[PDB]
PDB file of C-alpha atoms in Angstrom:
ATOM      1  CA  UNK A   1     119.594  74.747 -39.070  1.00 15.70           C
ATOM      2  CA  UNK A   2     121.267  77.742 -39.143  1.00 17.26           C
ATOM      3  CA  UNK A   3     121.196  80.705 -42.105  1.00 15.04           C
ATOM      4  CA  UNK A   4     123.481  80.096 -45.158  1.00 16.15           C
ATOM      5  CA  UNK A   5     125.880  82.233 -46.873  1.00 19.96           C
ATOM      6  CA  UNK A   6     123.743  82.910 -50.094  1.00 20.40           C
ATOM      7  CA  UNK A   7     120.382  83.148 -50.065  1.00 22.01           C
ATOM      8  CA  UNK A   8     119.208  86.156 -47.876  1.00 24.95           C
ATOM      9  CA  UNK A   9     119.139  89.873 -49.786  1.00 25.40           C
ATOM     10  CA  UNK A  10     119.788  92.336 -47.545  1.00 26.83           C
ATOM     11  CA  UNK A  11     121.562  89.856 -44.614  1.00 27.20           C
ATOM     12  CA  UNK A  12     125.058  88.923 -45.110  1.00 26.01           C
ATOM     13  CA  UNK A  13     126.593  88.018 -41.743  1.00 29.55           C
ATOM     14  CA  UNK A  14     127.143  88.711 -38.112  1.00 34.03           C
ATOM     15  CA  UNK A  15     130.005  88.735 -36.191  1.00 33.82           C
ATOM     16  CA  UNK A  16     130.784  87.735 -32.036  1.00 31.67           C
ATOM     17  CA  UNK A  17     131.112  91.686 -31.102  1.00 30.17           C
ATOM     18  CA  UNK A  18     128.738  92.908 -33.455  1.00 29.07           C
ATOM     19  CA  UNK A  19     125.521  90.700 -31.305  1.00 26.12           C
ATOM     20  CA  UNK A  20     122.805  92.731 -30.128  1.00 25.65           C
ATOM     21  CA  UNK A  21     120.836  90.039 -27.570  1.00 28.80           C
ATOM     22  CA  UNK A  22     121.363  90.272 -23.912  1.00 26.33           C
ATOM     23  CA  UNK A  23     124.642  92.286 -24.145  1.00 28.26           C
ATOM     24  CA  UNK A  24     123.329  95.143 -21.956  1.00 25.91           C
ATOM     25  CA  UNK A  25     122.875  92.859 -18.824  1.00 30.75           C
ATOM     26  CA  UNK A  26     125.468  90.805 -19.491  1.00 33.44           C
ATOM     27  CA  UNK A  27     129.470  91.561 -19.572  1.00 34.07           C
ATOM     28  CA  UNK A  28     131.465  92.839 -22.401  1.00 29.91           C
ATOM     29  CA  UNK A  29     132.259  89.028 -23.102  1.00 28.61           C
ATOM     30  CA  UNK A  30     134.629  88.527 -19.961  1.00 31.54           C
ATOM     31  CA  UNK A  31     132.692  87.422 -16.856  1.00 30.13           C
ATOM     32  CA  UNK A  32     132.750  91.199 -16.094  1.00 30.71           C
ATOM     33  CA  UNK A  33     129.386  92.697 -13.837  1.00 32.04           C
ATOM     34  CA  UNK A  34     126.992  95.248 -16.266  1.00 30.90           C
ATOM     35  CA  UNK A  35     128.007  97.216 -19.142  1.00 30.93           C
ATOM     36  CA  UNK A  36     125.406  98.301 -21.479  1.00 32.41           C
ATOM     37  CA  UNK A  37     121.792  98.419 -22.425  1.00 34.47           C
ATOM     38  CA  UNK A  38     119.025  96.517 -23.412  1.00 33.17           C
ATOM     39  CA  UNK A  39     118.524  95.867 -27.488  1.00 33.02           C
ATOM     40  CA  UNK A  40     116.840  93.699 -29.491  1.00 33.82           C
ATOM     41  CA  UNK A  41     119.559  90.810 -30.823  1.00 34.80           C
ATOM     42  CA  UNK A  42     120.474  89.979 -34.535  1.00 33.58           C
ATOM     43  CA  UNK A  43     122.244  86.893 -34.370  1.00 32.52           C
ATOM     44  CA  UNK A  44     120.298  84.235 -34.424  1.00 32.28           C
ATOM     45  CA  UNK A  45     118.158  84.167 -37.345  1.00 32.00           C
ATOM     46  CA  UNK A  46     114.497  82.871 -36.893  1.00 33.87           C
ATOM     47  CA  UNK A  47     112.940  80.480 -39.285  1.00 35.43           C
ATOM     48  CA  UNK A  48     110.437  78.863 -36.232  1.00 35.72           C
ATOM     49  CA  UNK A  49     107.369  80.290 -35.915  1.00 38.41           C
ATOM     50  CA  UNK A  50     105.595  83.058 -38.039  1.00 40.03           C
TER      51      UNK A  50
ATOM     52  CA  UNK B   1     171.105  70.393 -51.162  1.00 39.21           C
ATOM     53  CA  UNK B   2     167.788  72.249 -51.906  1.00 39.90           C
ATOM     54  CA  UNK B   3     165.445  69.776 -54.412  1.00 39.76           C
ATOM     55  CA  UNK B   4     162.133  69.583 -53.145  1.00 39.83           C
ATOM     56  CA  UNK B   5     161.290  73.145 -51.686  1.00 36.19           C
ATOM     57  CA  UNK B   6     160.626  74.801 -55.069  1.00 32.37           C
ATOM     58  CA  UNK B   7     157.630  72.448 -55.666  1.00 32.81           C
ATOM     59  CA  UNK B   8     155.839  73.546 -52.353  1.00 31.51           C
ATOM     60  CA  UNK B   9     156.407  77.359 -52.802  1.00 32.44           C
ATOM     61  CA  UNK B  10     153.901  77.345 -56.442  1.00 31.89           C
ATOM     62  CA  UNK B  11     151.470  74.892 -54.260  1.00 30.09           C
ATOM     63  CA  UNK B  12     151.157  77.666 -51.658  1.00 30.21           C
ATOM     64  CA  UNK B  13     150.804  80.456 -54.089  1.00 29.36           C
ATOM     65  CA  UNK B  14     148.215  78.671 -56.095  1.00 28.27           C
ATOM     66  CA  UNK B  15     146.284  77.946 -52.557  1.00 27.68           C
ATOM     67  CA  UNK B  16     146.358  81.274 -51.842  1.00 26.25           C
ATOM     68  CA  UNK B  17     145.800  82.937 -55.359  1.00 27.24           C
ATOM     69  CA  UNK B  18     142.768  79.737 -56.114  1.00 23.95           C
ATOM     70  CA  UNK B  19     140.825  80.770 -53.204  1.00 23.81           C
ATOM     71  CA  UNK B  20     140.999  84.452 -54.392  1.00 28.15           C
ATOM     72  CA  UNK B  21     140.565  83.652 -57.586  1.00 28.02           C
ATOM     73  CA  UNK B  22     137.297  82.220 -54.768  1.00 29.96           C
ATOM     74  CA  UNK B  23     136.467  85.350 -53.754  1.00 27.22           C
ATOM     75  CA  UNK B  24     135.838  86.712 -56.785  1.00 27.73           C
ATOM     76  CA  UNK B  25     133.409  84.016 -57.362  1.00 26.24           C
ATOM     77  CA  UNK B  26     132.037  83.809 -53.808  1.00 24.74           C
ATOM     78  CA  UNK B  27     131.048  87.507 -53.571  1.00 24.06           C
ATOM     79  CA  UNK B  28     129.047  87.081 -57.310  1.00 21.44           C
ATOM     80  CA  UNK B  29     126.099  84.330 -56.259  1.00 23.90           C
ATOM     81  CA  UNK B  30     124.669  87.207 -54.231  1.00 22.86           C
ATOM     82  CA  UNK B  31     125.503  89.665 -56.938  1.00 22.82           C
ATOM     83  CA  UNK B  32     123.744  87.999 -59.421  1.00 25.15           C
ATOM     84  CA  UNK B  33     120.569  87.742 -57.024  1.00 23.33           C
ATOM     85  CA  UNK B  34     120.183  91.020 -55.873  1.00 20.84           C
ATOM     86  CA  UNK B  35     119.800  92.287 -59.358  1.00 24.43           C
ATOM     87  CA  UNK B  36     116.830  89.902 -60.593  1.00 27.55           C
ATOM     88  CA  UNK B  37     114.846  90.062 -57.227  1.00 29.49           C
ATOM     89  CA  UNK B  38     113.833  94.139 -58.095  1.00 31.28           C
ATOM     90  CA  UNK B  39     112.715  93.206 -61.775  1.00 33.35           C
ATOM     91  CA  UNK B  40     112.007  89.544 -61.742  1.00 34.03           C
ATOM     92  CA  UNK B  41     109.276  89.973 -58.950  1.00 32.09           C
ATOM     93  CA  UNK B  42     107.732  93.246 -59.244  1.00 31.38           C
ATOM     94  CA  UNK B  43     104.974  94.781 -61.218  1.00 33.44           C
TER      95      UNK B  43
END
């Protein structure tokens, strides 16, 4: 289960450098050491839960 | 000695052109969604 491309109004899509969720502690996306911040993440799209 | 590649050149164009002609479509089943959410659901 994972969103579809038309339902959602404001959501479209997200990309692999455009993620939000642990990219502050982790690398850039090479096994590099630290380089960033923490944020909250936008990629994957909730539907468990509230 | 060319007889087949003229066929293949018109299969890539409409390939190219009838997923465009996709886009068009694609990009208009949100279109058409975000315009009756406003109306259709307030007031």
């Amino acid at each position: 289960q994972v969103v579809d491309d038309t339902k959602y109004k404001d959501y479209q899509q997200v990309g692999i450098l455009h993620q939000h969720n642990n990219s502050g502690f982790v690398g850039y996306l090479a096994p590099t050491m630290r380089e960033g911040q923490a944020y909250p993440a936008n990629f994957p799209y909730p539907l468990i839960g509230k | 000695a060319s007889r087949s590649s003229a066929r293949d050149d018109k299969l890539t164009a409409l390939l190219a052109q009838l997923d465009s002609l996709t886009r068009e479509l694609n990009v208009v089943s949100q279109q058409l969604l975000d315009l009756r959410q406003q109306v259709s659901a307030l007031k």
